[PDB]
C-alpha cells in the first residue's frame, strides 16, 4: 500500500507531453503557442487614408510653410484595385481606409478644403505624413506577433490573421482514450438482462476528461477474448498520451485483461491508502511508456480516483502551472466517518454561510454519490470521525 | 448618442432564449438539463456479489466446511440455485445464486476449490449489492435545471438514457463584409485587407459560451448579401456583422439589413467603439450586432454588449467579469461624457500583492498582445494619471 502522495508522484512523473502540432488558427483557441510568431506582412499592408479627404503632396498644400487650386484626378474607395500615381500639383479624393495613391505623402481633410469635385483648394495646410496610416504603422515584418508560451485568446487569433498566418504551432491537449472492460457490460441502448449492467464509467470518465482539459476519445466497451482486448488497447496506444480503463482491477474476473496489459507494459496494482478508491492500478504501455490508469467498476470510486490522479496528469500535460485544486477550510455540517490509516475523499457540497461568510461543507447509494458535488472533504489518514462544527479541508471542485 | 447603460439594456432585453433540444448525453456536458429524468428500473436489477468470494447463507458460516458446487463470473446470464450447506464461488459483479444471502470474502476463507472453510462469519447481506440498492423506480436521476457534469452524465447512463433534453448554447453567426476583405490563406492584392474580425470575434463568441459558426466574408451585391444573412437567421440566436458601419463601403449591407428588420445605428457614448449598430431581424427578432472594421473597437464592443447577450441567452445571472481596483501605471486620456474601455495589462505588485495596471492604449500590436484587462473609465473622468486607483475589468482566459 502506498500513500496518496507517493501515488501522485508516480503518475505525474510519468506524464507524456503531447508533441506540438501546426493547426488552423481558429482551432488554436485556448491553447499555448509553441513557436515565436513573427509578422511576415505589414499591418496595414499599404499606406491608407486615415480620414475622408484628398491625397496630396504636402508641399503642394502648404506643408512646408512652417520651415492655388489643384485638379482632382481620381477617387479611391476602400478595396480599390486600381493603381494610381499622383503627379506633382494633383489631388485624389480618398475615403477612410482607401489605398493611398503612389507618390502622395499626406491627406488634406475634407473639412480643410473647399470640397471641390474637379478642382480642390486647400483652406489649411497639412504636413508630410499627416492623416496617413502608413504601411506597417501598426505591425512591421519581423515584429513578434505572438510569443512562445502565450495562451492563444481571441486577440491573438486576430493578430495571427492580421499578419497572414493561417496556421500556428501549439501545444495540443493531451489525448485520452477511455475504455470499459467487463463481460457484464452493455451499452445504454440495450436492455440489461440478468448479470448485465450499463457501461456507466466510459461516459462519466470521458466527461471528466473533457472537463479536465484533455482531448478525449470514448472507446466504450472493449469485449472479447484477451487477444481481442489486446488489439483494442494497442489501437488506443497509437493515438493517446493517457489511457483510462475501468474493470481491470477488482479480482479474478479481470485476470485476462491484466495479463494482456502485462504483455503491453509495466503494470503496477499496489493499493493506495485512500477511500473510496483504494483498489486501483497504473501502468506504462508501449515503447513510449504511455500512462494507463486502471480504475474499478464502482462509478463513485472511479470519479474520485480520476479527480485525484488523472486530472493532475492532464493539467501538467497542458502546460498549466497550477496542477492541483484550491483547498479551503470549512465547517462540517454533518457527521462523517473515515478509515483509520487511509486518506478520505468525501464528495460534498461546499457553501458560504450568508450570516457569517464562513465556508460550510455537507457530506453527501449511487444516486447520492453521483449527485451535485462541488467539493471533496479531505480527511487525514489517522482521522476516523468528523463531527458537526469541525473545521476540515475541502477540495474545491471548480 | 446613447449611453453604454442604455445600449446594454436594449440588447439584453432582446436576447433570445434558445428552445430546448434533445441530444446525446455525452454532448450535454456543462449544459443545463431541461427535463426531469426518472429511473424506470431498479438498480442493480439483480443481487450481485460485491467482492470475490463464496456466495453462502450467512447462517451456514456462523452468521464446519461447505462444499463448493460452482463458480459464477461477472456477466453470467443463467440463474443458479444454492442448496443448503453449500457454497458457490463468485466474482465481483457476478449474479448472486438464488437462496444465498451473503458473500464470504476470498481472504476470509481457506480458499478451498472443492470444500471451503470460513475463517470468520459474515452476516446476512454482507458483501452483497441487493436489487435496487443503487436506484429504485421513480427515483429522480437528474432534475430539470441541473447543470450536467460528469457525475450526472454517469447517472443518465445508469438509468439507460441515451439522450436528454437540454437548454443549448445560443447559436451565433459571425459575418464580415467589405470589398477590401480577403481570407487569410490568400495573398492580398492591391487594396486588399485580411479578414481579421471574423476570426477574432468567432473566438470571442466561443469563449463567451456561444455555439459559433464563422460564416466569414459575405461577398456580392446587396441582394446576395441579404440571401446570406437570411440563411444565417435560420440557425442563429445572435448574428454579428463587421463592416456594416463605417462609411460608404457598407451602404448596400445596411440597405438590406433595413429590409430584414429595424436597424439602429445611433452612436454609443463610449471609446473605443462609439460607431456601432443593433437590429432585430425577421419575425423571430434575432439580435444582430453591427460592428466596425477596427479590430480593437470590435473586440471592445463584443465584450461590452455581445458577451452579456450570450450569457443572458444561457440564463446566467452572475456578473460578467470580475472588476478589481488597481493602481494606474501610466497616463490615459478620455473624453468627458463617454465611457472608456482601455485594453490593459493587470499585474500584482510583488512587494505588496497590490494590483497594478498598465494601459496599452501606434498601439494596436501591444493592445492585442499583452492584454488581460480593460480599464473602465467613467463618463465624467477625462484623464487617468499614474498613481490613480481605477476599475479594471479582468479579462479572464
Ligand atoms: Na482516515
Ligand atoms: Na470619460
Residue numbers in the entry:
A (entry chain B): 1 to 67, 78 to 374, 383 to 416
B (entry chain A): 1 to 63, 78 to 375, 382 to 417
What does the published report state?
In this work we have identified Glp, a gephyrin-like repurposed molybdotransferase MoeA enzyme, and its membrane receptor, GlpR, as components of the corynebacterial divisome. Our studies show that Glp and GlpR form a tight complex that is part of the early divisome, where Glp and GlpR directly bind FtsZ and Wag31, respectively, placing the Glp–GlpR complex at the centre of the divisome–elongasome transition.
The apo-structure was solved at 2.1 Å resolution and the structure of the complex was solved at 2.7 Å resolution. The structure of Glp is consistent with its annotation as MoeA, the enzyme involved in the synthesis of the molybdenum co-factor (Moco), which is present in all forms of life and is used by molybdoenzymes to mediate essential cellular functions such as energy generation and detoxification reactions, and to support virulence in pathogenic bacteria. This conformational change, also seen in the absence of ligand, generates the FtsZ-binding site within the central Glp dimer interface, far from the putative Mo-active site. In the phylogeny of these homologues, we identified a monophyletic clade that contains Cglu Glp and whose sequences are distinguished by two conserved proline-rich (pro-rich) regions. These regions correspond to the linkers connecting structural domains I and III, which differ between Glp and E. coli MoeA and are responsible for the hinge motion that generates the FtsZ-binding site in the former.
